[PDB]
Amino acid sequence: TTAKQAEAVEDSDINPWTGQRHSERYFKILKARRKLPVNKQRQEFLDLYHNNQILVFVGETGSGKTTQIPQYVLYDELPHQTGKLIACTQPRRVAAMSVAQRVADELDVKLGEEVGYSIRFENKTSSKTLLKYMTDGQLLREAMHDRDMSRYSCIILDEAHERTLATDILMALLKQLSERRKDLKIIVMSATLDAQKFQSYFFNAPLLAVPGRTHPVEIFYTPEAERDYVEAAIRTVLQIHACEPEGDILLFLTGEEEIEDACRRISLEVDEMIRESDAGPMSVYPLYGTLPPHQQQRIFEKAPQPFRPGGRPGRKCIVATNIAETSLTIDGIVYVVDPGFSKQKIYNPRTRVESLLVSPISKASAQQRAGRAGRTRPGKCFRLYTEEAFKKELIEQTYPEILRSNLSNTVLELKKLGVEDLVHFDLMDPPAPETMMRALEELNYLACLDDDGELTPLGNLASEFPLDPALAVMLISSPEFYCSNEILSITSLLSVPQIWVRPANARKRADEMKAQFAHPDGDHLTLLNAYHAYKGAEARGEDMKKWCHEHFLSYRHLSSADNVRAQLKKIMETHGIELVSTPFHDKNYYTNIRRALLAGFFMQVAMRESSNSKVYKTVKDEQLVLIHPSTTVTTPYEWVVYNEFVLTTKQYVRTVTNIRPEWLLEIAPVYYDLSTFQKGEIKNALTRVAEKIRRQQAMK
Ligand SMILES: Nc1ncnc2c1ncn2[C@@H]1O[C@H](COP(=O)(O)OP(=O)(O)O)[C@@H](O)[C@H]1O
Numbered sequence: 001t002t003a004k005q006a007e008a009v010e011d012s013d014i015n016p017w018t019g020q021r022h023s024e025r026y027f028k029i030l031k032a033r034r035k036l037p038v039n040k041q042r043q044e045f046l047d048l049y050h051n052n053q054i055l056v057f058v059g060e061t062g063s064g065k066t067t068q069i070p071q072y073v074l075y076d077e078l079p080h081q082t083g084k085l086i087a088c089t090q091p092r093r094v095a096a097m098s099v100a101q102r103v104a105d106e107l108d109v110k111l112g113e114e115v116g117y118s119i120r121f122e123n124k125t126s127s128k129t130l131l132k133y134m135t136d137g138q139l140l141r142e143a144m145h146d147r148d149m150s151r152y153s154c155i156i157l158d159e160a161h162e163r164t165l166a167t168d169i170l171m172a173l174l175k176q177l178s179e180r181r182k183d184l185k186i187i188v189m190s191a192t193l194d195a196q197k198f199q200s201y202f203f204n205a206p207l208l209a210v211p212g213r214t215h216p217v218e219i220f221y222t223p224e225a226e227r228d229y230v231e232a233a234i235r236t237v238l239q240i241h242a243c244e245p246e247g248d249i250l251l252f253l254t255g256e257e258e259i260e261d262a263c264r265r266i267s268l269e270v271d272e273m274i275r276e277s278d279a280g281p282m283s284v285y286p287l288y289g290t291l292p293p294h295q296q297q298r299i300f301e302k303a304p305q306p307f308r309p310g311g312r313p314g315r316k317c318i319v320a321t322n323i324a325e326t327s328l329t330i331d332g333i334v335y336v337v338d339p340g341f342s343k344q345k346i347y348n349p350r351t352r353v354e355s356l357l358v359s360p361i362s363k364a365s366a367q368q369r370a371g372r373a374g375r376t377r378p379g380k381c382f383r384l385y386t387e388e389a390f391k392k393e394l395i396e397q398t399y400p401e402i403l404r405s406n407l408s409n410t411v412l413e414l415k416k417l418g419v420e421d422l423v424h425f426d427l428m429d430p431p432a433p434e435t436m437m438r439a440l441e442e443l444n445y446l447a448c449l450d451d452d453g454e455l456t457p458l459g460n461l462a463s464e465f466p467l468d469p470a471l472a473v474m475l476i477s478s479p480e481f482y483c484s485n486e487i488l489s490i491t492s493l494l495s496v497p498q499i500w501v502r503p504a505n506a507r508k509r510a511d512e513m514k515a516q517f518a519h520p521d522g523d524h525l526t527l528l529n530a531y532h533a534y535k536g537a538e539a540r541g542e543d544m545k546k547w548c549h550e551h552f553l554s555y556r557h558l559s560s561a562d563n564v565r566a567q568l569k570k571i572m573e574t575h576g577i578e579l580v581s582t583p584f585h586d587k588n589y590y591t592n593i594r595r596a597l598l599a600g601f602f603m604q605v606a607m608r609e610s611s612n613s614k615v616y617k618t619v620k621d622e623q624l625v626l627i628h629p630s631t632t633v634t635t636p637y638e639w640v641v642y643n644e645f646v647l648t649t650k651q652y653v654r655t656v657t658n659i660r661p662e663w664l665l666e667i668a669p670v671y672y673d674l675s676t677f678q679k680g681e682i683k684n685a686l687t688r689v690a691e692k693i694r695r696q697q698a699m700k
């Protein structure tokens with residue numbers, strides 16, 4: 001129970017957890033461990049843990065939170081021998097695995113047995129497991145089948161400052177659960193918390209602040225912000241490799257393309273430095289999320305030895321995204337370059353699209369990056385921006401992800417957890433209640449939720465897609481319209497911002513190009529033609545940047561759309577959604593597609609006010625709109641399906657496609673149930689087309 005007791009147990013010749021003998025590596029590691037800052041307050045932790053259900057723990061980067069606290073908790077439950085496990089949630093998978101291996105080494109056990117990790121598509125745990133590291137998403141997935149989380153006695157949310165929606169949702173679930181289960185302990189850890197906020201959230205939970213730090217990190221700033229960070233970073237790296245002594249380098253960049261380019265740019269410069277200045281060898285390892293794990297774990301490889309003794313030291317440079325921003329202890333790292341940028345998610349409500357954008361990091365992010373040094377040995381962090389900018393310009397904390405995300409998918413994931421009430425589901429920073437309710441009923445009409453508010457198999461499958469639920473339903477139900485691939489492409493195109501560029505000046509030319517890509521019946525089909533042209537010109541080998549520039553298309557969003565198409569396709573193949581397509585020569589090649597649109601966009605339909613008028617009254621609510629000027633369709637029919645709603649001098653609908661009113665009554669009967677449908681001119685029109693159908697189909 002008390003610290004001295006646990007420490008007395010740790011000194012045992014025989015391992016209390018396996019019954020095997022402690023190797024002296026365990027004891028050397030142990031003597032190293034007891035010099036950590038958090039250790040010097042171990043008891044102070046225990047009697048807080050003993051007397052409180054929820055605890056907030058704050059210690060500087062490298063204090064020993066992630067690796068020592070779960071072990072403390074483990075030794076505190078020693079005399080009881082509970083069948084329940086201890087869970088620790090890292091924000092990234094690499095972190096979870098690395099730390100899991102580390103703690104497995106510290107407890108002198110085999111990884112996967114007593115100490116293990118758990119990630120999607122890979123469970124490294126056994127029936128012997130008492131300590132489990134995992135990602136917050138993985139725990140969030142386990143919570144779907146076990147809403148009480150009976151398998152765990154203590155849960156430790158780590159790096160909870162990131163405010164990722166998985167972390168937020170976890171905090172809310174655990175907060176609601178803590179009133180239900182009193183046998184569950186909850187710890188919240190970070191080096192960069194808004195402590196008072198998290199305390200206030202968890203019923204004024206106590207705070208433990210460990211002031212000590214292992215090794216110092218010498219942070220430096222640039223006298224003036226650099227015009228371009230990339231080559232500023234590369235120049236900094238080369239300057240380190242040249243002037244600075246022995247030590248591995250760590251550099252943070254935004255994207256993967258940028259990382260590769262910078263990687264072999266650094267390589268090409270380094271080789272010249274070798275051939276001209278007799279500099280030591282440098283091995284450059286890239287690191288990003290879409291990499292295969294076996295390449296990700298190559299960053300732990302030892303730095304190359306000097307060419308011959310007494311010569312310039314060889315070293316290892318790691319160019320990575322922000323996945324290495326937290327929780328990583330890469331031994332050998334001394335120098336850390338911080339350009340101060342990250343690819344952060346933003347969200348467009350009108351077009352319903354999530355998109356990434358390079359933005360300045362937060363202060364917490366910067367401190368977290370610099371914290372990757374001074375863990376095993378004293379380090380330095382070269383921040384490529386003014387100290388004044390860091391103190392008075394950088395955001396103090398990362399803006400919550402829930403507020404930058406599609407609430408329909410979020411709500412879908414909440415009902416996926418079985419959260420019966422949302423408005424009184426206490427999120428730390430809750431989204432607008434009405435938006436959540438509208439999201440709920442919109443999910444109800446899409447047959448993703450029952451009238452009772454539970455997951456439809458359709459909705460459950462739609463959650464597996466990285467898309468707006470409507471778009472996802474469209475894609476899933478597309479094979480029933482005999483045009484899966486085309487709808488896949490259209491989906492991927494609607495998953496990205498507007499690919500057509502229409503400059504404020506000289507928009508005539510843009511209209512002319514778009515007219516050359518035009519399809520008379522719908523703008524969606526025009527998008528399809530644009531993508532097909534793109535893939536053709538790419539197939540030739542023609543330069544696609546200049547090609548997109550000339551034909552007034554956005555290379556960024558077309559490329560993004562393409563990658564999205566690949567990923568989506570592989571997902572469909574994984575869950576067994578068959579990709580089929582009617583031949584182009586077929587009579588109903590386009591009608592199939594146009595019908596498949598209504599599978600998900602039946603709620604966004606506009607009817608012409610009257611034959612002579614240009615004004616449209618939308619099916620949703622009753623708002624007067626016009627067809628957006630940038631439209632392709634020459635003569636828009638009485639009924640159109642629109643993908644966007646814009647509000648300017650007058651309200652428009654954008655990216656429209658002509659449909660037939662019968663398709664509405666066919667594809668979405670429950671929504672267009674004329675028995676209970678709202679009174680209005682639309683109901684009248686639909687009753688007319690109905691009556692015609694009755695006539696002809698009773699005639700036989
Ligand atoms: N894989 C490892 N190899 C060597 N030393 C490590 C490793 N992981 C952690 N350490 C040491 O243990 C200390 C505690 O690290 P950690 O618990 O991850 O800190 P925190 O979780 O507080 O950020 C570090 O300062 C580091 O010196």
Ligand code: BEF
Pocket residue numbers: 059060061062063065066190191326327328371
């Ligand atoms: F605070 Be430590 F770097 F996880």
Ligand SMILES: [Mg+2]
Pocket residue numbers: 065066067327
């Ligand atoms: Mg940590």
